[PDB]
Structures are given as C-alpha cells and as structure tokens.
Design a protein around this ligand. Structure first.
Ligand SMILES: NC1CCN(c2ncnc3[nH]cnc23)CC1
Lengths: 337, 20
C-alpha cells in the first residue's frame, strides 16, 4: 500500500537522520560556474564535480551571516533533513562540507529554472498544468509529513523545473522534524497560514494551507492575498474572504475553499482521512498518482534546453567571490554540520 | 482588474522569507 511504502521510507530516513553524513567533499573538488539564486545568508551556484563531470547545485551559507540572522538551528535542520530524505521531487544532499567561512550543500541541479520565472512570464497556468504540479507537491508533503517533517516555505520561487518538466521542492531552510506543535514565525507573507500570523502553536496543516495559495497563484497568475506591504497581506489572510477568478472551475474553487480553510477542524490534509481528502477530491479525478510518482505522465511544459549545464532558464546575478578566512569562524555553532 | 492591480504592485518579483 501507500502505508507500506511510507513505512519503509521512514526506516530509510531514520537511519540517516540518526547518523548524518558529514564532510563528504571539499570545495576544491568543484568548479563553480554561475550563481543561480541568492539568499539572506546564502546563495546557490551551478558547479561541476571534476572527478565525474556531473553538474550540481551548490548552496553556500556564510556562517557569520547565519549567526547574525539567528538561523543556526534552522541551518542544521536543513542539512540534517536533506542528507536523510530521498523522494523523486526532492533534491537530497549528494555531498556536504564546511570550511573556515562557509557551509556547503551539494544537490541535484534542476536545469529548467524556477516555476516562479515561467509562471510570471506566461502569466498563469491552465488547470491541468496547475494540477500536474500540485500532484507532485501533494505527494511530497505526504512523504515529508509521514517523516514528521514540516516544510514551511512553499512558493513558486522554491519549485525548480527539471529536464523532464517535473518539480523539485527545494530550500529547506525552515524545514523541521517536530512531533506535535511548533511556534516559529517563518515562511513567506503571501503563503502564511492564519495560525502562524496569530502566533498560535501550529503543525503540518500550515503546509496544506500554503498548497492552497500555490494552486490559486498557479491558476490565477497572482496570489489570493496580496498588497504592497506584508501587514496589509496579513490583514487579508486573517479576514477570511478569498475571491476566485471567473475562469476558476467549480472543482477548483471547492478544493481551495477546503485548503484555504481558517478552521483547522475542516482544512483538508488535516482531517481524519488525512491526505486522501485531497487525493480523492474531484479536481484531482484525472490524476493517476502512481504515474505522477513514477514520472510516466507527460509534462504539460518541458524546459527549452540546449545543453547540459546550460543556464538560460535562470536569471543573472552578480557573481560574488567565495572567500575563505584563514581563521575558523563559528566552529562550535556548526560542529555537527 | 485584479491582474492589473497585481502587476502594478511591488510584489511581483521574488519574495523573501520572513523570520523575526
Ligand atoms: N529558487 C532557487 C534557485 C536556485 N536553487 C537551485 N537551482 C537549481 N537546482 C537546484 N537544486 C537545489 N537547489 C537548486 C535553489 C532555489
């Protein structure tokens, strides 16, 4: 069954969770090529592994910047979780290591670019296009949640398209293994559940709310709650009140009313029947879940490649040195990394 | 239109995480 598959998945995950891989490469083993994305204390570069000629995405965090942002424990979470998972829509760690200045995490490279880029350019996705992506998010959450993992940063910016037009759910800076309830204020304003905004304890159900926002944004081309400033966005989120575009099909609207549900006792994903309330919703009726997992389904859009290590589906960022101090920084803070 | 209001907004580009 699904249950059987997940039981084994847990066994695989827990072994790595309890005994994390550590120090499995060195910077000098990679040739850096291009910055693919940037972050607060971090950035991701395309690199080439010299021994194999394989291309990877290398996330580089500045240890001092992590400490100033109070993201030490969150960073340890990201690395510990990503070295332990394995799922077709996740990019597990191939390698990690650290040096005097930086932390490094090396993962599968998705050459298709961010969903964000294509969604913004094209404007919106058709319902079948939106559903193709949603399905993979549904499956990924089912996997993560069964591992007691909450993801906490669903948005198109983090959804990477691969060469076959399938999705990688990336950036686990806020992902956490937690049984029961947690309190940290984190995520992205447009995608925050009202629980988070109202500083309640919360759980995995916030990932299912964020799914509602995503599917809305994919199908409309804009989010259900937007404004110029985060406060105004939080006002809209807690108000209740979601307006749907006229072109939203009947089934879509119903699915979204059930994901974007402020009442936790009624929010899909969170009920007695779990993920199956979503999986068996009429909007997903044409979804062959096994075939999505297996990647047998034909992608509704497939990225325009013209080489391996081609980066035309990414924006251009200024290229910053990767500097390495002669002194070790923050050694204690990151001892287990 | 809501589309036009979105496109005119300051939040059509990449959106940063919040943290405290
Ligand atoms: N939105 C960001 C774009 C750069 N990133 C990335 N890009 C490409 N392949 C990857 N594998 C893991 N992370 C990545 C991280 C997310």
């Amino acid at each position: 069954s699904v249950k059987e598959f997940l039981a084994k998945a847990k066994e695989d995950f827990l072994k790595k969770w309890e005994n994390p891989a550590q120090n499995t490469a060195h910077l000098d083993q990679f040739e850096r090529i291009k910055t693919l994305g940037t972050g607060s204390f971090g950035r991701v570069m395309l690199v080439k592994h010299m021994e194999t000629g394989n291309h990877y995405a290398m996330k580089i965090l500045d240890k001092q910047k992590v400490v100033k942002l109070k993201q030490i424990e969150h960073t340890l979470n990201e690395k510990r979780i990503l070295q332990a998972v394995n799922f077709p829509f996740l990019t597990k760690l191939e390698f990690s290591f650290k040096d005097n200045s930086n932390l490094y995490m090396v993962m599968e490279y998705a050459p298709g670019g961010e969903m964000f880029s294509h969604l913004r350019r094209i404007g919106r996705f058709s319902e079948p296009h939106a559903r193709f992506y949603a399905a993979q998010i549904v499956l990924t959450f089912e996997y993560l949640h069964s591992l007691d993992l909450i993801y906490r940063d669903l948005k198109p910016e983090n959804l990477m398209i691969d060469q076959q037009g399938y999705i990688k759910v990336t950036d686990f800076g806020f992902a956490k293994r937690v049984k029961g309830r947690t309190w940290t204020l984190c995520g992205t304003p447009e995608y925050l559940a009202p629980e988070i905004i109202l500083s309640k304890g919360y759980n995995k159900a916030v990932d299912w709310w964020a799914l509602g926002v995503l599917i809305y944004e994919m199908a409309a081309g804009y989010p259900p709650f937007f404004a110029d400033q985060p406060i105004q966005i939080y006002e809209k989120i807690v108000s209740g009140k979601v307006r749907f575009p006229s072109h939203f099909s009947s089934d879509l609207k119903d699915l979204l009313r059930n994901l974007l549900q402020v009442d936790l006792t009624k929010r899909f994903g969170n009920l007695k029947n779990g993920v199956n309330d979503i999986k068996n919703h009429k909007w997903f009726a044409t979804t062959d879940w096994i075939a999505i997992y297996q990647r047998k389904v034909e992608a509704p859009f497939i990225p325009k490649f013209k080489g391996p290590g081609d980066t035309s589906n990414f924006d251009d960022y200024e290229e910053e040195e990767i500097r390495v101090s002669i002194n070790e920084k923050c050694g204690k803070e990151f001892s287990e990394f | 239109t809501t589309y036009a209001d979105f496109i005119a907004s300051g939040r059509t580009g990449r959106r940063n995480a919040i943290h405290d």
